[PDB]
Amino acid sequence: QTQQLHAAMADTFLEHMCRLDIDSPPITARNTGIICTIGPASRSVETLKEMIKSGMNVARLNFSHGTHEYHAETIKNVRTATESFASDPILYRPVAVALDTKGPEIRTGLIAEVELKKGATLKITLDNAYMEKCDENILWLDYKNICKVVEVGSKIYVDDGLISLQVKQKGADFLVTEVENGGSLGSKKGVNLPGAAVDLPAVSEKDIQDLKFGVEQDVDMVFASFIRKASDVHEVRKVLGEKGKNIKIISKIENHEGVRRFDEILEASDGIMVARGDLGIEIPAEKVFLAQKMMIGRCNRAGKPVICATQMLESMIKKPRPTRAEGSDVANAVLDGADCIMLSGETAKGDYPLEAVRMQHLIAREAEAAIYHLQLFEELRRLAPITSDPTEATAVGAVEASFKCCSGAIIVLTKSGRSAHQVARYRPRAPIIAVTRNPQTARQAHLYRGIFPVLCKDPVQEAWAEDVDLRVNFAMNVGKARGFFKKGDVVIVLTGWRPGSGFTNTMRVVPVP
Amino acid sequence: QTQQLHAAMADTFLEHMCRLDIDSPPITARNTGIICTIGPASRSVETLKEMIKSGMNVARLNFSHGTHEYHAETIKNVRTATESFASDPILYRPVAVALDTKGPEIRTGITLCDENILWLDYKNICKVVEVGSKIYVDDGLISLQVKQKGADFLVTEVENGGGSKKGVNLPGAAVDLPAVSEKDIQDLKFGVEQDVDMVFASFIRKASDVHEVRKVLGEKGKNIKIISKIENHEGVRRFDEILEASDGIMVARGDLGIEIPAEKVFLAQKMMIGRCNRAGKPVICATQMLESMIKKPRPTRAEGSDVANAVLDGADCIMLSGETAKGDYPLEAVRMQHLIAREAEAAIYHLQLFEELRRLAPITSDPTEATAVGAVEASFKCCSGAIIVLTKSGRSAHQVARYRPRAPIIAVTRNPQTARQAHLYRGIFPVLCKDPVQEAWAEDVDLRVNFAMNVGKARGFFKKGDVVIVLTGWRPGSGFTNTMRVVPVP
Amino acid sequence: QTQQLHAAMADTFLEHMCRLDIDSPPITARNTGIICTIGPASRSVETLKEMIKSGMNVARLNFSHGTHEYHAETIKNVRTATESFASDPILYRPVAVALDTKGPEIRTDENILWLDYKNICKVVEVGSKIYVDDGLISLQENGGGVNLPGAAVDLPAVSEKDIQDLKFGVEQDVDMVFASFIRKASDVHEVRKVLGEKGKNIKIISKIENHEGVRRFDEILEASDGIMVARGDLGIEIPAEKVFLAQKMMIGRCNRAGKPVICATQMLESMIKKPRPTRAEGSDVANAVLDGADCIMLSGETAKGDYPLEAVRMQHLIAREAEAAIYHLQLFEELRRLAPITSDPTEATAVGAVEASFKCCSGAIIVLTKSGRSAHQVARYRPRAPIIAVTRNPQTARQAHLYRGIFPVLCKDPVQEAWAEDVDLRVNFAMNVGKARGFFKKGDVVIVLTGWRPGSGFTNTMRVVPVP
Amino acid sequence: QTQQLHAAMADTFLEHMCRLDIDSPPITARNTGIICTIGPASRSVETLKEMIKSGMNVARLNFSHGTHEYHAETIKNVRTATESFASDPILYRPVAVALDTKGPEIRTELKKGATLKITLDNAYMEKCDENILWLDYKNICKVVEVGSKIYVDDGLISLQVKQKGADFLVTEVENGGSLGSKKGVNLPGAAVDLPAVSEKDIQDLKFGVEQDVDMVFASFIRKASDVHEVRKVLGEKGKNIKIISKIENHEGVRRFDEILEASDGIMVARGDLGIEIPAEKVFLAQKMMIGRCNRAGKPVICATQMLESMIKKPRPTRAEGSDVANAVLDGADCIMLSGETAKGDYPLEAVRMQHLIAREAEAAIYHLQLFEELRRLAPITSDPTEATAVGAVEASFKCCSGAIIVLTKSGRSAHQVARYRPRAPIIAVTRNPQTARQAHLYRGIFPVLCKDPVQEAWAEDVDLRVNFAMNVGKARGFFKKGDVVIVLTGWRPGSGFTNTMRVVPVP
Ligand SMILES: O=P(O)(O)OC[C@H]1O[C@](O)(COP(=O)(O)O)[C@@H](O)[C@@H]1O
């Protein structure tokens, strides 16, 4: 009568649906990471403490706005609030810090507003004499290569898709367009080129400086904007360089080229953000659910983290409760298989930052139980390469074992995170407690569905066996304290055959002491 | 390269997901019916003509507010806009008319009105509640827990705080308010008088509530379909009996989400859709699907998600409420549901869906079901432009829709009501033949099949030379559908 | 409770196995064609009538031995016996005649041994193995007819004898040829060429008998009309423990292509001397039908055995029991997944008809057909229900026994003036056939497949009708 | 690619068939146990040594015939043959001894259509003529109704009951034949009330205990109570001797479930079953029984006429090679030889053949859907031993391990791995001689008997035995240094503490 275990037993997906039960309560542990954008609503130490207690695992800093000193104080506040729980490692929740880059943009110049008439002509010019003299006849852009990347018939969107232009003739340093969808044109408006291969650099002058700030500020991950190809990922990696080699690169897929070149992008990245906001400007909004499900599926298939983002609980900016469409959207992202779900304006500037978080947490947990693990696991098992790698064999064996005995947890010792990530890719129902002494591994582990990172602070015991056991019991204490299991329950424990990374090979079924 | 047919051939659901392709265009035909609430924004004859052109199939009138005269004029305006396309039967689109009842409510002015004492109109509340039981006021704004129950008094402690005549909900309680209120009685009579196609019955909690709506409609209303609106915990609990007694179901998410934790609504939705899909009865997903478009010309990303996932869940019909009744952009809201539903329909994993549906398809001796399922399999085999079905009552085409073909079901009928009510079923495009009955029956049959051919051609569903499936029967009258033919479009 | 219908509902194959029930009786109809080799035991007119009554659908004639006069009289007697039933076309059973060729061969003191294959040095290398006298002797091994395991033997597609034997077959109006020792597609094209234009409608069934035939199976299947799993010679060429792999591989690939596959040799071998078979033999027959063989075969069991008739009756009993035990639920799911979205109306009609038949558990699928093609298309999707194929073409009726499920029936009535009534006549003929044979009764639902006009290629109409 | 791993990857069963490849060679290990009936052709110590080297795992003694003295000597010879290899424990193969009971029987020119009286009057106990026939089953009338069939001399003659008395029955002959003396009588569809064990059986069973047999094949089991009675005869002294119930008639098939639950395993006794039931239905009974045994996780034996022609011929028929293959594909834990090894001209060849076929068929199993299904039809219990076992089998698939190595005192931990039907061989390491012999009943279990003394450091004692397993697999040719294998151990000594799985290289 709990955790949708009746529906879990259904031999078909239809009967699985039919069995979903509002009176079947979930478990305590919530497996989907919650990423919260920080802003004036949620930036104080006191409000960040409650953000943490409400379920925030990752603090997102949006670098489209705010100075470096502004962002350094946000990061300070986040760390002050996070370490205010440090005294008891058993309860301490790690919180990661994500730097989301502004990235390359196309801006128009100065106009004050002009009215564009649907069906009228408008000329785009790269001639800087019209740079501060834009009007309903002539509009200047700052993308000096635009003529090389568009064709007669190509569409140009101005001000987050509000205005739609179609190129009717191309010149030298100008294009002549017809206004499809008119409206009020303004100054300094964002511009998108649906379907174009935009040749703006992978990282802007500003991103370059912001990225190097992220290294100095010891950020855990970068959300890299407007990634269109693998070479763009490689430039971000290169800018972060040697000292930033362990910072995770999440590519943001925000346009048609990124969706189409997705495979090469995913290969080069540590993870992916389905940036639905900008993506639904670049592509028809009715197609966005296809790109989301395709991307979640392919990341799931590759074992790489995927984040569903933007407007998930949007009304909660003004109202203390979501719309039904919004709660549907969060549940369905989890059902699709997103590792993480994201809050933007709902936490940064909204009237109800805490309710928004607490709601993603309630929905995430309800949806995690509603997942059809029976076919999910079968398909991932079917789709799993037969290879000699002992660490993979061990990971899959532990997930199989966890389903067999419906265990309270899969406990994993990990230095880098990788052994825990390997378990997460098989989508166990039980929560993965990733015991680590590496504080960065513990913060970054939040990117993966099911992983519950715990930061062990005990000294290394001189007998290695004792030291392993010490960390395994730390994990049992965390599970007991957090209410994931109780003394007598069975849990699965993963360890390796010598110290250091890459030797995970040992799966035990143990009672909770 | 089209209609997500690469994704359709995937051996696993996971691969099916991976193959979903924004560069793969859908077909013209949209299978999921669109139900539009009519109100001040959409009531004019001119606007309704555009609602129809945009894709509205059913006009919902909400009898929570409005005079009978107001509603009578709305219905009249819907019929004028509809019949203004009647001159060409090939392009004529039927539009049904749905009456959505106010239903039983609890209202404020806890005795049986200030910070101290509050008065409620529901007199049997003390018998239905217990100590610890929760009471919500003004659409779940305020929350109350009873600390002591008395004769005509409840003593509560307020949980969440923050007016006159406000709505009360009593979560997890068996409310004994009558099936059909005093105002409901008058309104169902008006529904009969005005020839409504369907009643959407509010706050159905059990089978006997549907039987009461059925009894009130009685012999004069015996062809009006009853769609039970599930809006509270009891109606989720007692869903199986309610479904058995009903002609279809509305997932009334608005109120449902006041009654149960907002985070559980997707479970109740997916359960009711799956179970209606299993039973072959129409299911409507309702409420706040494109809510932001009341004030904005474009929806949030979570809103287009919700509409797509509703279609993927298996809903026969989707709904708009304030979005089309009173918002600033009603035609846009309609057009947006048409676009998404169409994308999502291509995205369904028909391969497993059809597999699982027929694995429940009973081995009855019934020839009509055997013919229906053969036709759907044949439609998958040749990827047909359409399944064309001659039906008097709709039943023959309902039986095809039950197996969820990819191809559109052109249901040809001479019955105007049959044509309007077919919209409740995923994939049915009802066309109303007006040609006289031919002397020879065989010629009469062929005349309506050719009518359907011309409709599909005129709507861009198929062109000369394509292959379609045609379902007919061996003799006149309902219940004899037994003949499936694979024919080319002339 | 009948026809293993409880087991048929199992959602898994393990549970399907667990529900198989010896108290669940099969239907009357037996879908798997039985092919009988004729010799001294089974060549008299008297014995042949009983072979037919017992369930013989095809008369195999082994041209490894016998003169043209000998074989001429066997065929004469098979036709005499077959046509002794023609008086009532409702109960008359067509019987096909298959010519099985001798094929190319390698033939032969302890000091020096001579063989007749001139290119043997080129085709073999030091380390290669040579078997003599049906694998009884081995050379590089085993002391105590030459086979070249795993070698590309360049003997001709057909010998000189094969050419006049096929010529004789054309003269004698045989329905099919079982071509021996097929190694490549070009061998099949040679048999096709020799048969020529006058023998254009004679079906070529390739006998797969060696490691090269197996490795090159796909080009061979494409070029043939069907396949024989010739387990005898194939078990000499390859290790006998590997023969079931080859059998199942070929049956699977044949079902995948929708072409007839025959399982042959030693199926009921002990019944040459004994009146009933061993448990291994009963198991072999049942499993060949479960594998998906269109036809099963008897050689010495019927050619020279003491119990020819008991060997036929026993195959009939087992095949009928095994047909019920097939896990149709997944078989049909897989066939329908493994078949393409074509624009071909007849294919959509065929598959919809089989779908319908499962849905109402119909007593038959009745199909009018001139060439047999419309019925072949239906049999490809492996329906539980028997396929009553009505044809006016006697060659079509006789060749239709190659396909699982097809009960071919030859309509003798003249063509009716109006086409509508002509079709109804043949549909009623099918109804009368089914009732007389006990396949179904009045009130039962059947599926009926017709076209929209006369001539082949226009099958487009499926109807679900009660038996009148 | 080897052991049909291309076919192993097929998304469908049809495609799996289509990929089966004769040029894909098996692994060296062979998982299906082989039971050989020992008789005049296989009794010698020297012949038995070669039987063992050919692949005999279990020596079956049929007590239908032969004295206690004769059978005692057969056992002695099997043990002398078996222990001749005991010098090297790495190459030593355990061999089990199974006692097959005679069971409850019914014993006595007939023209078809003629009348025949079946009388129970002992006056005619030696005057069995064509007119009147005597039987030794006094209750036969109790369980005979008008219309019942009666078979005589292993189904050679058939009769139907037309009139009924108490001492007699008026039959008419269906299938005529030559009626001999003291021939076997079967009653199809009858609820025969003969005891679970005859007087002779009770003696032979107690002799079984005296002789320390590993298992009993109990003839003619028709109901749960029959199995309990066999269990009561073996008593506390024979409490560890495994009871394999022989399913030989309609009643046992119909009541299979209650019989399965009480037994330690099942024999599909095809010979006698095909006299009781129409021969064409036996394959249904076999598949039903193997499936349900697979589902219950209890060993099932396929038996009788599998390589029958090899009694006289050095090579089998195509139908016989097919039959052995299909039994393995069905999921039979063990395959059996009777006359082929007991009395035939080619006993060693019959064993080597079943060995060659078994191995091929084992590669040709569709593990993908087999393990999927086993795992779906599989309870969620708090049992850590079951969860470790399933995790090891999944791990073995994921990395295509060369073996699953399991330490087991009682055999239970290895039985639990074997029930998930891994492709990889289960090398079960035990110090318990009876555990090692009885483990042969289970598909995939290769028992090895460790005879090192118990090390004072238990961690070392555990590792000693894992390394012993490594040495066996290298010597046997199951794998080699650098190959990855799965190792199953427990957290403390004694049964029921298996909980540790490790993926490791062969050293
Ligand atoms: O779906 P229903 O109500 O059973 O109607 C289907 C009927 O339509 C027909 O195709 C034509 O019937 P009519 O000519 O009376 O309209 C019948 O053969 C068939 O029984």
Ligand SMILES: O=P(O)(O)OC[C@H]1O[C@](O)(COP(=O)(O)O)[C@@H](O)[C@@H]1O
């Ligand atoms: O299987 P075939 O050779 O295509 O024949 C099927 C034909 O049989 C028919 O049902 C009847 O045709 P005929 O009248 O020419 O015999 C046709 O409609 C159809 O095309």
Ligand SMILES: O=P(O)(O)OC[C@H]1O[C@](O)(COP(=O)(O)O)[C@@H](O)[C@@H]1O
């Ligand atoms: O299969 P069983 O009978 O449970 O035996 C498994 C046992 O074997 C062991 O690995 C070793 O046990 P011993 O040292 O007592 O032989 C235990 O850890 C484990 O419980």
